[PDB]
Structure formats: C-alpha cells, structure tokens
Amino acid sequence: VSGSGVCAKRVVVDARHHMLGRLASIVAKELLNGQRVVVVRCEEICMSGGLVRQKMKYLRFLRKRMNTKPSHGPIHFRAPAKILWRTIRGMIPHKTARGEAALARLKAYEGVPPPYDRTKRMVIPDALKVLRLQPGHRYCLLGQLSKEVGWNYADTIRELEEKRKEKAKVSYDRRKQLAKLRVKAEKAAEEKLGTQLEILAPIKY
C-alpha cells in the first residue's frame, strides 16, 4: 500500500460491508500521505469471525484498566465511529507530530450526515466483504458489536437512515425521469447532426 495519488479535496468512503482491518489499513496510509478522508456508515463495517469471537475480544479489552486510577487507563469507546478511529490510530504512529496531523485529517461518522448525503461516496475494493471473505465464514457488523457492548444510539442512527434513504430514493426517481428525456434528446440532436459527428463513431461506447 503506497497511496491513491489523488488530488481530491477529500474522499468520502461509504464503509458499509468493508473489512475493519483492511479498510483501516488503506485509510491510514492515505492520511499519512496527506490526504483527507471522510468515512461514513461505520455502523455497517464488517468484521470476520462472528459476533461471539468479537464480543469476547472486546470484553477482554474492557478488562484492561489502570488499577490505581481507571480514568487514566485505557479508554474504551462504544460508538462504531470511535471504534474505527482507534483501530486506525493503532495503524498510525500517533505519538508523533506527523501522526497527530494524520489523525486530524480523518472524520468518521455513524450514518451519513450532511453534507455527505448529497456527495458521491466511493468504495475501496481492496477491503470489500464480497472480495475478501468466503461466503460461509462468520462475520458481524460493527454496529452489532457496539449495540451489545453499550452503545445507546443504535436506534437513533436507524431512525435517521430510513428517512435519509427514503429521501434519497425519490431523488433516484427524479433523476430517472430526467435521464430518459435526455436520452431521447441524444438521438434527436444526433440525427440533426449527420456526418458532422462522424469522428465520434469509432470511439463511442
């Protein structure tokens, strides 16, 4: 992993059905390479090995605390966005100025808040579940783990997403109509211009 090499102002990544470790590794190198990343829908991140293994792993994590001052001890986050951020922090040198700067470039959210709902959301093929996991091997959703370890905002994230997904689908239909009339325009204009568009025939698909 070297880096995307892209000049985008930011890259919004829809983390649904990505693998936490593979996604975190890709995102971490991007942050080090100076890029800014937004990751949305972290409740939908997938983890290999079922819920039971992942619950056990997380409750071993709850055991670790400074015996004489637990508030100083390891800080156990419940929200999926914070689970993602600490997994990324594990893959960055975060005790240097350079790694502090890298972590600043990362924003992680549960669900798709504004303005990121009207933005195009990219996917990282190297971490997708369909390509990285063999159908029939246990996995859980990072939202599911948080629910069972004490994240009390699962339902509000669910309420908000349904209203957004409905609001996005009517927009799907509105563009669906606009796409069709534009298509008929394509023909109607492309017959108005005859040989004058001949140079495009062998390079079109």
Binding site: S4, V11, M122, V123, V130, L131
Partner: protein, 177 residues
C-alpha cells in the same frame, strides 16, 4: 515456459578395476530441477542400492526426457515413498496434466500441503500414464466425463494490469456466476 522439475536418464557405472574391465552399467529416470541436482541424486541411490559411491564411480550420460504430446491431457499415477514425523510410508497418487513434469510438480505440492512432507523426504518409486477406465482416485474420475459442465464459483476481480489499479471506485464490483 520452464517446468520446475525435469525428468532425466542418468547412466553410470563403477570404475574399471584391475579385474572387471567391464563393470555393469546402471540407469535411472530421475526428477530434479537441473542436471547438477540430477547427477547428485543418481549417486544417492547408487550408493545405497548398488553399493557404488560417486568416488569409486563414473558418470556416462545424462539426457532430459520431454513429453511427446504436451498439447493433450494425460492421467497419471505416481508411486512414492516418503518419511513422516514418525516413520516411512508408501503412497499412491492420481494427477491430470498435459505433461508429466506438470504432474510431478503437483505431487510435491500436495505432499507439502496435505502432509507437510518436504522434497528431501520423498522418493518416487514408479511413474505411469494410467489411461482412463483404470484411474482409481475419485477426484480424477469425475473429470472423465464428456458433457462436463460447471460454473465458476470463485472468480478473481482484478484489472488486466496494475496500470489500471485505483484505490477508490464509484460503484461496487458487479459479480455473477
């Protein structure tokens, strides 16, 4: 391209002594990754089978055996002797390959996989082209079926070359088998 393994005839005999100006000549068919390793393994068997060491011996000829019809599919049997963690065993195998070199390469691979056996621990007794109608293993027989038909249940999603690699993509990959 190259085959990792090659089949060799190796010919050799003891040194002519003040008696026996015509010592007896031996041959084997050996598998190795080059001539040098082929000659070395010849002198292994001929020390421990026919009691002639490389020192008191002489090398006569070494030739590479090639497949006659590489473009066709042959079934194969391999009789092999190997060493486990607690002894020695005899094992028989069936393979399908266009060349017998290809058949041997699979055999070493499945021994290192299914049994953790390394190449310095395997001796190939006998090799053969078992014609179909006499193949024993069930894996090899299910391919002896004209009207063979099956889907590709596993299919790699990857660009033609790394030139077209990206990190991000607009849409999810579209797969159907």
């Amino acid at each position: 391209v190259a085959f990792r393994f090659h089949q060799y005839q190796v010919v050799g005999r003891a040194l002519p002594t003040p008696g026996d100006e015509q010592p007896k000549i031996y041959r084997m068919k050996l598998w190795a990754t080059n001539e040098v390793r082929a000659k070395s393994k010849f002198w292994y068997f001929l020390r421990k089978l026919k009691k002639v060491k490389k020192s008191n011996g002489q090398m006569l000829a070494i030739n590479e055996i090639f497949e006659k019809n590489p473009t066709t599919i042959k079934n194969y049997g391999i009789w092999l002797r190997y060493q486990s963690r607690t002894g020695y065993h005899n094992m028989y195998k069936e393979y399908r390959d266009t060349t017998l070199n290809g058949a041997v390469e699979q055999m070493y691979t499945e021994m290192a996989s299914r049994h953790r056996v390394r190449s310095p621990c395997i001796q190939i007794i006998k090799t053969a082209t078992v014609n179909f109608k006499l193949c024993k293993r069930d894996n090899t027989k299910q391919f002896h079926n004209s009207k063979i038909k099956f889907p590709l249940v596993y299919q790699k999603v990857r660009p033609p070359t790394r030139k077209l690699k990206t990190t991000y993509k607009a849409t999810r990959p579209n797969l159907f088998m």
